[PDB]
Amino acid sequence: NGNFVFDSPISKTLLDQYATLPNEFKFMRYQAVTCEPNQLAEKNFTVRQLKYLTPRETELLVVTMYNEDHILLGRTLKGMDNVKYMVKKKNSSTWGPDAWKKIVCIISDGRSKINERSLALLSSLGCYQDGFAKDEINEKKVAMHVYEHTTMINITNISESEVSLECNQGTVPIQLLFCLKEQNQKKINSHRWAFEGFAELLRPNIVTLLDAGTMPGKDSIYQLWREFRNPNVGGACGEIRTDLGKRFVKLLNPLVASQNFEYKMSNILDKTTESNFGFITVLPGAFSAYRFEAVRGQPLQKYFYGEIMENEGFHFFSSNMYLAEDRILCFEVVTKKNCNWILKYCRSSYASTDVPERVPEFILQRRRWLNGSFFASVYSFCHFYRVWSSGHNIGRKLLLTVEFFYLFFNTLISWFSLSSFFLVFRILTVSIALAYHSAFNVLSVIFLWLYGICTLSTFILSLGNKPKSTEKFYVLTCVIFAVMMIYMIFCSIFMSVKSFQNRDIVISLGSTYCLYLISSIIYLQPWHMLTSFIQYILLSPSYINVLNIYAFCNVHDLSWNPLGKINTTEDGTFKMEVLVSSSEIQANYDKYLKVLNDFEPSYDEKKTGYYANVRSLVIIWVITNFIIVAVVLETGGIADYIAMKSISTAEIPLMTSKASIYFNVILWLVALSALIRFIGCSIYMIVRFFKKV
Amino acid sequence: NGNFVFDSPISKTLLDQYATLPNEFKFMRYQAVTCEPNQLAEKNFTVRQLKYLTPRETELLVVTMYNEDHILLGRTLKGMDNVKYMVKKKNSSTWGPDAWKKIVCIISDGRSKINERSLALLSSLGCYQDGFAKDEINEKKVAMHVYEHTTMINITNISESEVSLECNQGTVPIQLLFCLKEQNQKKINSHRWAFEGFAELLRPNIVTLLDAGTMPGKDSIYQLWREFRNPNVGGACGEIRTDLGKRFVKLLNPLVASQNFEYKMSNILDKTTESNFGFITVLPGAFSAYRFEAVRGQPLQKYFYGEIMENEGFHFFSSNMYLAEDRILCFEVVTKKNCNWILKYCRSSYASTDVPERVPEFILQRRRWLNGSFFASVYSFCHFYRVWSSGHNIGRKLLLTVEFFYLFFNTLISWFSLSSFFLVFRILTVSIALAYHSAFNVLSVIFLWLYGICTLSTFILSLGNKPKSTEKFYVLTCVIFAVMMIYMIFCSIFMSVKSFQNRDIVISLGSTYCLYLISSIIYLQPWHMLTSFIQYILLSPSYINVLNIYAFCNVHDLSWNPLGKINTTEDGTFKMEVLVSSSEIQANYDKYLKVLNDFEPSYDEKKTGYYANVRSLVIIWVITNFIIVAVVLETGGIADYIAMKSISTAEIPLMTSKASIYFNVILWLVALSALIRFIGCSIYMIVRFFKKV
Ligand SMILES: C[C@@H]([C@H](N)C(=O)N[C@H](C(=O)O)[C@H]1O[C@@H](n2ccc(=O)[nH]c2=O)[C@H](O)[C@@H]1O)[C@H](O)c1ccc(O)cn1
Ligand SMILES: C[C@@H]([C@H](N)C(=O)N[C@H](C(=O)O)[C@H]1O[C@@H](n2ccc(=O)[nH]c2=O)[C@H](O)[C@@H]1O)[C@H](O)c1ccc(O)cn1
C-alpha cells in the first residue's frame, strides 16, 4: 500500500522450543514507519492485531527505554508474571485461558544509544533481527522501526549477571511490539508515539505506563486494572518502592536509605491524602495507568503541544508549561469539561524501581522534579477556577477547591524553606549560648560561617558549573549540613533537659514523630521507621539547601561560497576562463566604486534570551526569603535604625521577642501539616477497609 | 615554484589618474598562501619587495580589521598623512624624496565577516579585484589571499558619509599589502601572520601595530619611530585619545565622557610613572611599536604558543596565560636574557580611537581588560626574579624591582575595592545619622537595601545571563549607583561643614583632586578636568561594582552507520540481497546469545571542566572581601560573640572605633597613590624637558 513491510522467519532454534504452529508464532513483521506519529492510520500502516480473520480487541503496556542495560529491561519484562497471573485467573468475566490475546509495546529511543546487550535479549525473545533496517525509503527518511511477534519464552529468574529464559508447557504467549526510533526525541515523543500512534490503531481500554527498570509486582498490574472498574476513575497509580538490592544491602548508602524513607512517607501521607479529595498531583511515570478515553482530546493536546493560543511573543504559562511535563495530564483530566474523571491511588499495587546512588546524579534528577512540581502547582493554583467549569457534582467541586488551597499552602511553605531553616538554626544556636555561655559562643560563630560559605559556594557552583565537574565539593557540603543538623538536635535536647530540670519544642516535634510513627503503623508497613529514619534526618538539611538552590538556579537548561578549485598534473599545467576583457574589469571596478558610493537574530537565540531572563528573575526567591530573615532577626540595618530612632528622642539588643514568636509559629505550623496528613491517611485506610469488608 | 600566483591589470580608469609608468603601478599580484604563517619562506612564497633588480630594504605597519565599516578603515588609512610627512622631510638621513619605498600590511580576517563597503574602498585604492580567489589548490586548502600593489591615490577628507580619494602631483605612493584570511582565527592569529609570516620575509626595522578605526596624528608615526633612535628601546606606545566626534558632540554620553577622563588620566599619571622605571605594563594594541629584533624569539614564542614546558595535565600559569594576550610581550621583552630592552612612553604621538557607547558593549569590552590585567599582574609578580636574570645594569634592576612591588600594591588595592567601597559607604551613612538623626536613619536603611539588591542581581545576571539580554537592568544599576555616590558626596560635605562650624576627609580627598589638577596642568592638557570630571565621579561606583563583578564572574568564556536505502519505480518493485541461508540466521542468533553471555571524554570537555572550576574558585574574592567587612563593622556574628563573652564574666554597640581607624586608613592610602603618581608625572615631564632643551 505504498509502505515498506517485511516478514522474516525466526531461527529454527526458537522453533525447537515453540513446537514443545500458527502464522502468529513462526514469523515476525517489520513495518517501517516514516510518517509522523499522528498519521499511522491514514498512511495505511497496520499491526498484526487488525489483520486476523476477526480483529483482536485489546484490553490493556508501554515500556519507555533509552540506554538501560539488559538487567533493567529484564526486570521490567519479568514483572510476564502479571500476564501469567491473568490467564490463570479462573472466576472472571474479562480474563481466562486466552487472556493474553487482550494484552499487548516497548518504545526504544534511537539505535545509537540502545544497549546492544538489551537488543540481545529482545532478539532472544524473537522480536528483532538485524539485517533489514532501511534508513530511507523513496526520498522519505524512516522514523520508526516497528518489529512485531508473539513469543513463548518467559524470563523466570534474574541474577546479578544473567536473565534466564525458558519455554515449557507452563509459559504463556506475549504479544510483543518493539518500536525503535532512529533518533533520541526525549520521553515526551515516545509517549507521543505510544498515545497518538499505536494507541489509535489498537484502541485499548487502559494504557499503563511502565519505565524500563521498574518491576511491577506479581499482581500489581491486575490490581491497577481493577481500579478502573469504577466508571469514574480516569487515572491511577501505585506505590513506588526503592530497590534495596539482595539482603537489603543497598540500605547502607545514606543517599539510598534517605530516598527509601522519602518515597515511603510520600506514599503513606501525601498520596492517600490527595486521593481522598480525588486529584493526585503527580502520577509517577514509572508506574501509572490512564483510561484511554479519559486522556484523549484536551489532555493530550496540552501535554504534547501546549497552550496553542499564543501570539508571536512569549507568555509565562504557555511558554513554560513544558517544564511540568507529565503533571499537565492529571490537571487536565480531573478538570475536564463535561466529564467527571478522578484520579485514584491504589496501595495494593507496588513497583520497585532503582534510585540514583551518587550525589551528582541525584541532584540532576531532583532538578527536574522540583521545577516540575513548582511550575505545576503555580499553574494549578492560577487556573483553579476550571474546577468549577467541569462536570463534577457540587460536593466534589468543593472538595477539590479545598485541596487546591491546601496544596498551595504546602507550596508556599516549601518556597520559604531556605529562610525557615536558617532562622531556626540561628535562633536556636544563639539562644543556647545566651543561656549557658560555656563554649556555645564559639560554635555559634563557627557554624554561622560554615553555613555562609557552603551556601555561597552552592549558588556559585550551581549558577556557573556542573555537578559532575565538582562532586567532592557536593559530598563535603552534604557532610557539613549533616553535622549542622546534629548540632541542632544536641542544642534542642540540651535546652529541653535543662528546662525540665528548672518546652514546646518537644510537644510539637514529638507529635510530628509520633504522628509519623502512627501513620506508618496504620499503613501496616513500619519497617522503614527505624532502618532509615536517621539518614533522612541527617540528609534533610541538604534537601532544603542544596537541591533547592540547584533547582532554582538551573530552571531552563540554557544553551547559548566555495568559489574555486585547482587540480593539476605532476608538471602543474592547467587552464580555466579568465576575465580577460578589460571592459569587464572596469565594470567590476565601477561596481565597487558604486558600492562605496551607496553609503533580530534566530528565533532560537531570542527564545534562549527569554528563557535565561526568567531563570534570573526567579532566583532574585532570595530577596523574599531574606525579607523574612531581616524582619525576624533584625538584620539588614533595621536594628540600627531602631537604635538611632531611640537616640533621636543607645544600644542594640542581642536577641528579641520576634525570634520567640516566630520560632513558635514554625514548630506549630509544621505540626499542623503532620496532623492533617495523619487524618487523611486514616480516612483513606478506613474507607478502603469498609469497601473491602 | 609549486605555488599559485597571478598578476592582473588594474582598471584603465585608475591608469587615467596614474598617468597624470612602471610595472609596480600598473599591475597587482595575488599570491595564494595555503601553508602555516611560519612557513612562507621555505614554501617559496615571496612579495614584490624581494623581486626587483635590487631588493627593497624595509624600514617600517600592520592594521588588524574584522568587520569595521569603511569609515573606520578610511580613518586609519588617512592617518598616508604620516607617509607624506615623511617624504617631505628634508633634513634627515633616513627619509627623503623616495621614503615611501621603505614603508609597507592590512590583515583582514575572513571573507564572510568583512564589510564589503570596505572591500569597495580597498578596490578603489587598487589592491583587490574579485574574480580569482581559489578556495583550494591541489588537495590543499587555501589559507590566505595576499593581494599587493602600490597605489597613487590618497584619502584626503572623511565626512560622516563618504571617503574622498584623489590622485594629483601632490599625492605619494603607498605600498599596500592586503591579506585576507578565509576564516576568523581571532586577533592572536592575525598578529601571528604579521610577525611570523610577512615580517620574516620583509625583515623590517620597526613593526607598528595599528587597529582599524584608530587614526594616528599627522606626525604620530614619525614621532613614534623617533623613540627608537635610542638603541635600548624595544617597544613604545603613544597616547590614545577618545574620539569625541565633530564639535565634541559625543562628550554628552556619560559613558563616553567617563571614558575620555579615564583614558586621559591613565595617560597622564599611570603611563608616565611606569615609563620612568622602564616597563610599561600594557602597550595598547591600537597604537604600539616594537623593534623587530627585540621581540623575535622568546617573547613571540610565549605570546603565540605559551609556556611550552607542560605535562598532559593543566597548570595555572601555563594554561591560563592566554588571558593576558598582548601583555606577555612587554614582560618578556623587558626581562629578556642577556638583553637590556626597555619600554618607553611617547607623549608627542597620539591616536584617536572609538569607544563603546552602550552599557552592554562597554561591559563586554572591559571584561577582557580586567581579566588580562589581573592575570598579567599575577604572572609578573610571581615571576619577577627574572628581572635579575636579564642584562640590565644593577640600577635598572633595582628600579624595576621597586616598580614591580608598587604595581602589586596597586593590584592588591584594586582586588579589595568591592569591600572598600561598601565600607566607606556604610560607615559614612551610619555616622551622619548618628550625628544628626533627622531623616538619615531612613536613608541609611534604604540605601543599604538598594546596594544589596543591585549587587545580588549583578552576581546572578553575570553568572547566568548575558549583558545583551538584559540592558535595561544594567542601565538602571548604573543609575542607582550614581545616586548612591551623590548621596555619599552630600553626606561628606554636610559632615565637614558642620564640623568646621563646631575634617581629614577634606585634607586627603582635596589633595587627591588638587594633585589630579596639578598633574593635568603640568601635562599641558587640562581641558578634561571640567568637561568630563563629574561623569567620571558619578559613573565610578559602577566601575567598582558592575565591571568587576562581571569581570570575575566570566573569567574564561566557557562552552560546555547509514546501513540501507530503497528506491523503487512508480509500481514499487525492486530487489536486493537477503540473508536467506538459515545457517547465517542461526549464526547471528548465536552471536547475540554470546553477546548476552559476555557479561574520560573529549579533551575539550576536560579542558572546559578545568576552566569552569578555576572561574568558580576566583569568585569564591567574595570571602576575602567579606573578611575585611566583618572585621571592621563587626558583622558575621562577631559583635554578638563579644557581647556574649562580656556576659559570661550586655548590649551591642552601634558604631565602633575600628570604623574610624579604617576610614582614616583608606583616605590616606588613596592620597598616597595620587602623591606617588604626581611625583612620577613631574619627573617624566622634567626629564623630557631637559633632553629637549
Ligand atoms: C525516574 C524513574 C526511573 N528511575 C527513570 O529513570 N525514568 C526515566 C525518566 O523519567 O525520564 C525514564 O525515561 C527514559 N528516558 C531517558 C532519557 C531520554 O532521553 N529519553 C527517555 O525516554 C529512561 O530510559 C527511563 O525509562 C524513577 O523510577 C521514579 C520516577 C518517579 C517517581 O515518583 C519515582 N521514581
Ligand atoms: C580595543 C581598541 C579598538 N577599539 C579595537 O576594537 N581593537 C580590536 C581588539 O582589541 O580585538 C581589534 O581586533 C580586531 N579583531 C576583532 C575580532 C576578531 O575576531 N579578530 C580581530 O582581529 C578588531 O577588528 C579591532 O581592530 C581600542 O581602540 C583600545 C585598545 C586598547 C586601549 O588601551 C585603548 N583603546
Numbering used by the authors:
A (entry chain B), B (entry chain A): 382 to 401, 409 to 448, 450 to 468, 470 to 494, 496 to 893, 912 to 969, 977 to 1015, 1025 to 1045, ...
Question: What sentences appear in the manuscript?
Answer:
Nikkomycin Z (NikkoZ), another peptidyl nucleoside inhibitor of chitin synthase, has shown significant clinical benefits in mammals against pathogenic fungi. The nucleoside moieties of PolyB and NikkoZ are the same 5-aminohexuronic acid N-glycosidically bound to uracil. In contrast, the peptidyl moieties of PolyB contain carbamoylpolyoxamic acid, and NikkoZ contains hydroxypyridylhomothreonine. We determined the structures of Chs1-PolyB and the Chs1-NikkoZ complex at 3.6-Å and 2.4-Å resolution, respectively. Comparison between Chs1 maps in the apo and inhibitor-bound states revealed clearly elongated extra densities corresponding to PolyB and NikkoZ in the active site, consistent with their function as substrate competitive inhibitors. The nucleoside moieties of PolyB and NikkoZ are stabilized by T453, M454, Y455, and K578 at the top of the active site, which are the same residues interacting with the nucleoside group of UDP-GlcNAc. In contrast, unlike the flexible GlcNAc moiety of UDP-GlcNAc extending away from the active site, the peptidyl moieties of PolyB and NikkoZ extend toward the chitin transport channel and form extensive interactions with E457, D602, A677, and W760. Besides, the switch loop of Chs1 is open in our Chs1-PolyB and Chs1-NikkoZ structures. Notably, end part of the peptidyl moieties of PolyB and NikkoZ occupy the GlcNAc acceptor binding site, and thus block the chitin transport channel. Therefore, our structures suggest that the peptidyl nucleoside inhibitors inhibit chitin synthases using a unique mechanism: the nucleoside moiety competes with UDP binding, and the peptidyl moiety induces the switch loop open and blocks the gate of chitin transport channel.
Chitin is a long-chain polymer of β-(1,4)-linked N-acetylglucosamine (GlcNAc) and is synthesized by chitin synthase in the plasma membrane. In this report, we determined seven cryo-electron microscopy (cryo-EM) structures of S. cerevisiae Chs1 in the apo state and in complex with UDP-GlcNAc, UDP-GlcNAc+GlcNAc, UDP, UDP+GlcNAc, PolyB, and NikkoZ. The overall structure of Chs1 reveals a dimer architecture with a twofold symmetry and is ~100 Å tall and 110 Å wide. Each Chs1 monomer is composed of a large cytosolic soluble region and a transmembrane domain (TMD), with both the N-terminus and C-terminus in the cytosol.
